[PDB]
Design a protein around this ligand. Sequence first.
Ligand SMILES: *C1=CC(=O)c2cccc(O)c2C1=O
Ligand SMILES: [Cl-]
Ligand SMILES: [Cl-]
Ligand SMILES: [Mn+2]
Ligand SMILES: [Zn+2]
Length: 472
Amino acid sequence: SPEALLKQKLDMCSKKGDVLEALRLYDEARRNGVQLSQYHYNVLLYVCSLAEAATESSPNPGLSRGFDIFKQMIVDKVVPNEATFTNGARLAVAKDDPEMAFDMVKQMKAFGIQPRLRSYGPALFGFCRKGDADKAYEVDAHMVESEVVPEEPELAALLKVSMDTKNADKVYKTLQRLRDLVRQVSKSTFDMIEEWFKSEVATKTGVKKWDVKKIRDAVVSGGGGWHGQGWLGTGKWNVKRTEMDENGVCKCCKEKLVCIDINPVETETFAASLTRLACEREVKANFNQFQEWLERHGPFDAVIDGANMGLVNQRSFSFFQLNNTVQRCQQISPSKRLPLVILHKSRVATYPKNRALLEKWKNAGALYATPPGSNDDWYWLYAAVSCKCLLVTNDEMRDHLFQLLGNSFFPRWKEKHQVRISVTREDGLKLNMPPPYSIVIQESEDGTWHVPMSVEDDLQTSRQWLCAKRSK
Ligand SMILES: *C1=CC(=O)c2cccc(O)c2C1=O
Ligand SMILES: [Cl-]
Ligand SMILES: [Cl-]
Ligand SMILES: [Mn+2]
Ligand SMILES: [Zn+2]
């Protein structure tokens, strides 16, 4: 077959980085009357993106033709897949022309194709590198219209370009978008934000007089932790790196951070999504069986990730650590409920009295053994969300299948529900409870800002905060 033969030769081309040969095969196919599929185009976009950007001559046919191939792909109305968008962006990155990168996205739009976040990157980051705020903001508005949500790198570059063009209104807006969408910021974004607050433009932006009750209403209206009404105060900002104590009080300024509620409707939506995701990956009957078991049991104040409690910081499964955690969860339950222990069925172990206790917990309605081949992470997560209770796990809950859960609701839910164990020589096991405040960028009623850094493990490393408060 002609298509089959092209594919083979393009795959060979892609294996060898043979861009000149891929371009000749592209032309030969046009001369032979062979129609290019989605697959064919995707290999060419990738192959073309291996071509260098020329400093010392006019652009090379590799990059130059890649863009013509992209435009021809879209005119054909070949249905894109995830490799299309990826390769399209690789080509855009290779070229380093934000305007042409932006052109590709405008083309997609014109032919009813939904662009991906990574399609916009080359445009945004390019325009941001060149200091062209106006075009960066055009790219941003375009993402917004296309309902593609930015992540931190995009928000950070917008922040940086706003700082570069002295655009204090845009700095403020991006800061709110970081609050809303990212919550805690990377080291590089943290440093950027500290620079902003120490800068002359920041010193010279503000108001001495404002409507105290209009701030009041916006605070109530936003959900708490911010007002969104603009920069307040005047003069130099006092900007310190600092920490919050255990009650959410800033050690620099003594402001008590707020605790922000989760709307129970978001929680219901999330619970549905969670069921939907689990059924796609689990054997439906296995997850349904747990749902039906759960409906018949409880109530629960805590759900334990048994495997994690057995294995965190251990060279092998520690029944002691599991059992000690169960006892401690029961001790903090106001009515002394046993926690729901989720374990794989291969455990339920080697010592007779431990086996008897596992069986006793099962007989008490407080243990569920997840079936052969299941991923027990779905089970403990669905249980804690459904029961609206504490979740006891040291699992980081970021990598692999937890990415499916998203980055708005789930992190907020985690913060309010997750209990982590820590162990010291002197004291043994401790339960580290949800904090009595929200770890998020916060803007107070008087215009004071507290900005938290993101960390791998906030029990391992004490979390750094920025405290930005007007000196008058
Ligand atoms: C926010 C505020 C608060 O006082 C509190 C107390 C106990 C447990 C929590 O999760 C919270 C909270 O999230
Ligand atoms: Cl109760
Ligand atoms: Cl005993
Ligand atoms: Mn696990
Ligand atoms: Zn403070």
